[PDB]
Amino acid sequence: SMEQVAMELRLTELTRLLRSVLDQLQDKDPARIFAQPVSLKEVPDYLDHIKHPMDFATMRKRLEAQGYKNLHEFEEDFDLIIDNCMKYNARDTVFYRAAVRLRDQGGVVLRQARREVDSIG
Ligand code: NA
């Protein structure tokens, strides 16, 4: 049908838009603390603390399969990265402080990203 084609183009444009949103949010972690999933070889007890780990590489693979249906779903994953980091690591660590600064600078990107998703439709 044409109406599924029209749905599919919308998804396809959104994914293109979220690519840009992702790339900007990843430009706010220049250490690359959040680039890859936490190694279970290096931190064996990590899944005793964190039931839904999340990182940027994972979020990229879901995107290029067009797996994000709205902006909420994208935001939900992004928030896991920050919330997982600030729970596992203490206040006085470079990990927690990298999550705080990513949160505060990514708020600027996601607030205008919300207006662009609405505005086009
Ligand atoms: Na903690």
DSSP per-residue letters across the chain: -HHHHHHHHHHHHHHHHHHHHHHHHHTT-TT-TTSSPPPTTTSTTHHHH-SS---HHHHHHHHHTT---SHHHHHHHHHHHHHHHHHHS-TTSHHHHHHHHHHHHHHHHHHHHHHHHHHH-
Distance 90 CA to ligand 1 centre (A): 5
- Spatial separation of the C-alpha atoms in residues 112 and 70, rounded to whole Å: 15
Number of domains in the chain: 1
Structure tokens at 8: 């599919």
This structure's resolution (Å) is 2.8
Q: What is the dihedral of CA 111, 76, 53, 36, to 10 degrees?
A: -40
Q: How was this structure determined?
A: X-ray
**Domain containing 1 — which CATH number?**
1.20.920.10
Domain containing residue 31: 1-121
Distance 3 CA to ligand 1 centre (A): 48
Instruction: Specify whether the CB–CB gap between 89 and 96 falls below 8 A.
Output: yes
Distance 87 CA to ligand 1 centre (A): 3
Distance 27 CA to ligand 1 centre (A): 25
Q: What is the CA radius of gyration of the chain?
A: 16
